[PDB]
């Protein structure tokens, strides 16, 4: 009666949903095929004398421990007289990367070697320079051995490797410029806000611009440390604060006024300011307020805690960076008088149902992001099985009208749906036009791409051999055909202009023709800047394009129009292109936040991207770089060749600054699993690691720590599923006590922030969470001298099996909306906690102490019997009592306003009790954002995801009933409206960041209409007065009443 007795016969009884919460796998661990080598294993020791003696070993046993036992045991075997002293030998074996690593560091333990089969060969040290074969260091940090690059064919790869060393040396030379000061300046750069200018609400916490500080000092042996409690102007500098603190330290009843002054000078310069609790320093003359540490302390109602530290106890700690060069040290295109044609030959390895599909063909096009000619196909010949076409494809474009960065984009298709795809660059890295025969391995159609051809997709062949390999042939013109020099493209511009000045006025009915020569209309001159203001994502009309293209010379007045102009150039018309090249040559720089558009996938020309780098070189502070670092590392993908100006810029700034370095390492190492970019990023990470000085050692210790945790959780998730937490926890603690873990997981730097150190592992506070992703709550002793002043314990969550980078980006976007708002003078306090992806669905998330899901607030405050709308509000009163309560509601109201807007604008996941968090002091913040740009609409919602229940509203309006109608809530509303328009005026940036992210294979960002959601939500097609009303409309329906005027 329920199911109309309708049987499903297919439904099998066993069979995913059953524990469906841990997607990404797999890997091999400490030995081939197995995660964790048996505690006691036997290994075969191939001697030089030919004898295989099979040592029973412990998994954690060090190589010297093994050798010393091997050579004791080889006395008992035959041919002993043939062996040297044990000291004249090194170990060697085959690894899981299938190279033959020599094991020089005989402290290393057997499980940590990444062996393949448990066997070790004995040999004598090959190469007098052992020193040189600590590339394995680099190989470990990168996670693929350097010897793998040496035997690469490609001259580009080889050219990049040797050419890029230019950069490495230029930054290392800056590091030893004022050594030891500059070396410290690399290692511990000043952690500063962007502007010294202070927002009013920060200032008003200052009683006429002053702060009480605490400068600590140590004497003998150490231990008794002594507070010196200054009260100095906010905008005074460190060298002044160090004087005042010495003044105070060294006033006395046995020292005259003068005698002190002369003591102060000799003492003043021998010290510097450290933050207590972490390795941060105040190394150059910034107004004190401007360091991040202070400005937080102000905002948090905290008294800063610095430390006088001698320069020789800091120049103690910096070892030498000491860089070494490695062991690895025509006829103009415009002459060609033909059109383009490309010969398709055969596609070999296509996997299709002959029963389901009729016919298969090759679609093809030329591109620049958008395309230089009518797109073609070929005839639907030898369909499905046996599929070949021997066809010259005929492209309506002359060969001189290909732009430097021209690209063929092709795909095999069915009838209409694509099977595979792959894109080639019509030129090579040495300017040379592609000719002859090319074998293109293809890429599988992604989730988001329904479109036939995929021209945003990555340039070059898939390395994965067993895929559709579609081979093809390019026309040959009896020489390497090279692209024009710039001296020649210049000349042809200076002609294209001189010729343009002698056409008839009858001809000015062309409309791409600025007949308003130097004088122009005021309506025109205004309608141009009206374009300028428009976001990147508003499509431009042929009329506007032409209108721009003609007036291009007035467009230098508005530098900011350049992106719109560049898209208005006919890149299929080498006259137009050679001219645009000549504008771009000396076009006024622009703001990075605008110049970063020019590095996205719609501007692939190298002249353009150059102008864009040049902008960064001027206007981009090292603060603002690490802010946008993700979007820059991402945008490398969109470069045509390995060696280019952006890679050199980033490589240099990273070797200039070890904080940028740090994240620049991980953001590359993060994406190393992805074969789109393994080669590119692999090579770049070689150069970084080769030139970064001692940080290569620090990275390796982090790198090794992450691997322990990867192997550990990979086990927990596979063999140990279907066991009690009790069982798993008893297995996790068993494991972490092993000395190889204890070595590998203790003294090292938080990859979330290398300022924090990690030191001892507190195992009783270490545990697995409930989640079936089996995340480890890991907890470290902050080993700082003044741990007690900052946090005695550091604790951060390692989560195997979850793609962190959506979260990563939303947090970064929030972090930006905050900085935007707070310089605007609207204090809304978001808490964008740390998140770092270190791999393929592997990452780190910062723990915010003293915070709970609304749900625990309601479980803890839940009455015995069958929760209360007030319980949140009652739990918050419970904490904050007095005039503390009044200001704690201000915090909840300030955060809760901003988090409403960010959430609405981004369109992050639906919020509820178990992903909304409230802190003791009363700040609210969101966690686990999931799909960010409204990725469940693929199955015009303009959704409101943060919908403020009674719970929140009560708390917003102290304790009232009919909260809807308080001033408390009138204030809150005004916060939301001011925040929303704030972000609407910076929407060019948020679009641009999201554009720059299409590079990563996040399914939420496959192409621009994904991003277009953030137009509607900000209502950019409207005017701000309707925007407001749209937002108010939007917010009103979700809440069921509240929002007008």
């Amino acid at each position: 009666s329920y199911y109309h007795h309708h049987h499903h016969h297919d439904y099998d009884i066993p069979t995913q949903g059953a524990m469906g919460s841990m997607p990404p796998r797999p890997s091999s661990g400490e030995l081939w095929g197995i995660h964790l080598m048996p505690p006691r294993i036997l290994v075969e020791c191939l001697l030089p004398n030919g004898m295989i003696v099979t040592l029973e070993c412990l998994r954690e046993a060090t190589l010297i421990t093994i050798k010393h036992e091997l050579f004791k045991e080889a006395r008992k075997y035959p041919l002993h007289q043939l062996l040297q002293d044990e000291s004249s030998y090194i170990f060697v074996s085959v690894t899981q990367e299938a190279e033959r690593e020599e094991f020089f560091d005989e402290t290393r333990r057997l499980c940590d070697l990444r062996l393949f089969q448990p066997f070790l060969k004995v040999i004598e040290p090959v190469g007098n320079r052992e020193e040189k074969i600590l590339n394995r260091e680099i190989g470990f940090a990168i996670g693929m051995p350097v010897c793998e690059f040496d035997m690469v064919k490609d001259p580009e790869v080889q050219d990049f490797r040797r050419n890029i060393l230019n950069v490495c040396k230029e930054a290392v030379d800056l590091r030893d410029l004022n050594s030891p000061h500059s070396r410290a300046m690399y290692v511990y750069p000043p952690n500063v806000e962007s502007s010294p200018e202070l927002p009013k609400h920060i200032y008003n916490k200052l009683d006429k611009g002053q702060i009480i500080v605490v400068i600590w000092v140590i004497v003998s042996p150490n231990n008794d440390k002594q507070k010196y409690t200054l009260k100095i102007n906010h905008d005074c500098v460190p060298e002044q604060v160090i004087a005042e603190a010495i003044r105070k330290k060294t006033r006395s009843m046995l020292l005259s006024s003068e005698q002190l002054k002369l003591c102060v000078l000799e003492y003043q310069g021998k010290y510097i300011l450290k933050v207590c609790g972490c390795d941060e320093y105040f190394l150059e003359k910034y107004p004190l307020s401007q360091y991040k540490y202070i400005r937080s302390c102000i905002m948090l109602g905290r008294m800063p805690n610095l430390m006088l530290m001698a320069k020789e106890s800091l120049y103690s700690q910096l070892p030498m960076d000491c860089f070494t060069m490695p062991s690895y040290s025509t006829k103009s295109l415009w002459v060609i008088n033909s059109a383009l044609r490309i010969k398709i030959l055969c596609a070999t390895y296509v996997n299709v149902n002959i029963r389901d599909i009729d016919k298969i063909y090759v679609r093809t096009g030329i591109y620049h992001g958008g395309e230089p000619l009518c797109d073609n196909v070929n005839t639907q010949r030898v369909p499905c099985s046996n599929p070949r076409w021997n066809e010259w494809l005929n492209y309506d474009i002359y060969i001189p009208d290909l732009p430097r960065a021209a690209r063929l984009c092709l795909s095999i298709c069915s009838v209409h749906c694509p099977l595979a795809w792959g894109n080639i660059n019509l030129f090579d890295y040495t300017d040379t036009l592609v000719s002859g025969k090319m074998a293109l391995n293809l890429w599988p159609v992604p989730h988001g791409l329904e479109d036939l051809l995929n021209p945003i997709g990555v340039t070059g062949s898939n390395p994965n051999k067993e895929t559709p390999c579609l081979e093809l042939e390019f026309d040959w013109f009896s020489s390497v055909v090279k692209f024009p020099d710039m001296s020649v493209i210049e000349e042809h511009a200076n002609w294209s202009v001189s010729r343009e000045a002698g056409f008839s006025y009858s001809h000015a009915g062309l409309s791409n023709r600025l007949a308003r020569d130097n004088e122009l209309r005021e309506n025109d001159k205004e309608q141009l800047k009206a374009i300028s203001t428009r976001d990147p994502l508003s499509e431009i009309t042929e009329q506007e394009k032409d209108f721009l293209w003609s007036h291009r010379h007035y467009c230098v007045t508005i530098p900011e129009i350049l992106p719109k102009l560049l898209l208005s150039v006919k890149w299929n018309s080498r006259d137009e292109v050679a001219q645009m090249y000549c504008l771009v040559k000396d076009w006024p720089p622009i703001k990075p936040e605008q110049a970063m558009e020019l590095l996205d996938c719609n501007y692939p020309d190298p002249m353009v991207r150059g102008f864009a780098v040049r902008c960064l070189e001027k206007y981009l502070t090292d603060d603002k770089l690490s802010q946008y670092l993700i979007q820059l590392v991402q945008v490398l993908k969109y470069e045509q060749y390995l060696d280019n100006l952006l890679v050199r810029f980033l490589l240099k700034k990273a070797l200039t600054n070890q904080r940028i370095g740090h994240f620049f390492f991980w953001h590359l190492k993060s994406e190393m699993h992805n074969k789109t970019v393994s080669q590119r990023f692999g090579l770049l990470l070689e150069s970084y690691c080769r030139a970064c000085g001692m940080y290569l050692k620090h990275l390796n210790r982090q790198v090794e720590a992450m691997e322990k945790l990867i192997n550990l959780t990979d086990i927990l998730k596979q063999e140990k599923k279907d066991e009690t937490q009790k069982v798993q926890m008893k297995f996790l603690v068993e494991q972490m006590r092993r000395p190889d873990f204890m070595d590998a997981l203790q003294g090292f730097l938080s990859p979330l922030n290398p300022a924090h150190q990690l030191g001892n592992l507190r195992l009783e506070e270490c545990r697995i969470m409930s989640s079936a992703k089996r995340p480890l709550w890991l907890n470290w002793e902050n080993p700082d001298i003044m741990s007690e002043l900052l946090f005695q314990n550091n604790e951060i969550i390692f989560k195997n099996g979850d793609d962190l980078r959506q979260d990563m980006l939303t947090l970064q976007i929030i972090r930006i909306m905050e900085n935007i708002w707070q310089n605007q003078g609207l204090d809304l306090r978001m808490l964008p906690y740390g998140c770092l992806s270190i791999g393929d669905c592997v990452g780190l998330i910062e723990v915010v102490r003293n915070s709970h899901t609304i749900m625990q607030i309601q479980c803890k405050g839940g009455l015995k019997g069958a929760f209360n709308s007030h319980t949140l509000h009652q739990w918050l009163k419970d904490k904050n009592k007095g005039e503390i309560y009044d200001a704690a509601i201000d915090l909840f109201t300030r955060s809760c306003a901003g988090y409403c807007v960010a959430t609405f604008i981004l369109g992050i996941g639906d919020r509820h009790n178990s992903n909304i968090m409230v802190k003791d002091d009363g700040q609210l913040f969101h966690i686990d954002f999931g799909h960010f740009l409204d990725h469940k609409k693929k199955k015009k919602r303009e959704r409101v995801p943060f919908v403020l229940t009674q719970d929140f509203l009560i708390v917003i309006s102290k304790g009232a009933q009919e909260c809807t109608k308080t001033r408390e809530f009138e204030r809150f509303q005004e916060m939301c409206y001011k925040a929303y328009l704030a972000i609407r005026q910076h929407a060019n940036l948020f679009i641009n960041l999201f554009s720059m992210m299409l590079g990563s294979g996040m399914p939420e960002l496959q192409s621009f209409d994904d991003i277009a959601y953030i137009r509607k939500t900000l209502a950019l097609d409207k005017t701000e007065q309707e925007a407001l009303e749209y937002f108010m409309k939007q917010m009103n329906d979700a809440h069921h009443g509240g929002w007008t005027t």
């Binding site: 004898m51 749906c417 989730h447 042929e542 009329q543 199955k939 209409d1009």
Partner: protein, 239 residues
């Protein structure tokens, strides 16, 4: 007819999305209707809204603005159902069929990418076997040098006692080599079994993709046909 006109930003792209080289339609007022031709968002000769669009369905836009050699498609089913509510059911049905179809596609795109990795892990492992073996093959050859020097030298001393425990060691060595090679062989056969399943993953993805686009495509026009009659943007959600 000028309001209606059959063809008359964001949701224009999603109706131009996946259409031919020729398809079109027409869409701040204090700014300029916008012709949106797919191959191009679009003066002086103003002698002509329905007037202008008929003129260039026949004719190319080449003489208008030099590089626009493109004219054609001005874009029915739903079982022609003038039922409203029964068109409403079918939306949910196709939408469940489509959603059903995406999971099957999503599942397989995972298996595909594992099977790409799992395979490529296997390949490297074989390279590693082959190198492992080459070191044992060098070792069995390494011992044949110095062992057969330590047979003929002396010979009387130890005698079979010496050469036995050298010959045993040398047994162990080549028989270990036997195990390793048979280990490698067994990987390579498992490799082609993986590669077999891998081919079959693509195969069913390529046969799900076309149905996935049609199911989508129907569901769009079903949901168009509804929004045509009664605005009801809110009733659609449950479906």
């Amino acid at each position: 007819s000028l309001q209606d006109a059959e063809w008359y930003r964001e949701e224009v792209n999603e109706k131009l999305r996946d259409t031919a080289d020729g398809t079109f339609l027409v869409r701040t007022k204090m700014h300029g209707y916008t012709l949106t031709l797919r191959k191009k968002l679009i003066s002086d000769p103003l002698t002509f809204v329905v007037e202008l669009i008929n003129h260039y369905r026949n004719e190319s836009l080449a003489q208008y603005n030099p590089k626009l050699d493109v004219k054609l498609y001005p874009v029915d089913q739903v079982v022609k159902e003038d039922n409203i509510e029964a068109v409403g059911k079918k939306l949910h049905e196709y939408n469940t069929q489509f959603q059903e179809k995406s999971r099957e596609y999503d599942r397989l795109y995972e298996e595909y990418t594992r099977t790409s990795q799992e395979i490529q892990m296997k390949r490297t492992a074989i390279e590693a076997f082959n190198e492992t073996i080459k070191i044992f093959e060098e070792q069995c050859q390494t011992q044949e040098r110095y062992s057969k020097e330590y047979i003929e030298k002396f010979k009387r001393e130890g005698n079979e006692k010496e050469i036995q425990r050298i010959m045993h060691n040398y047994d162990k060595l080549k028989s270990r080599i036997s195990e390793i090679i048979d280990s490698r062989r067994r990987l390579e056969e498992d490799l082609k079994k993986q590669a077999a399943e891998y081919r079959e993953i693509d195969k069913r993805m390529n046969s799900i993709k076309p149905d996935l686009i049609q199911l989508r495509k129907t569901r769009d026009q079903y949901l168009m046909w509804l929004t045509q009659k009664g605005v009801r943007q809110k009733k659609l959600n449950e479906w």
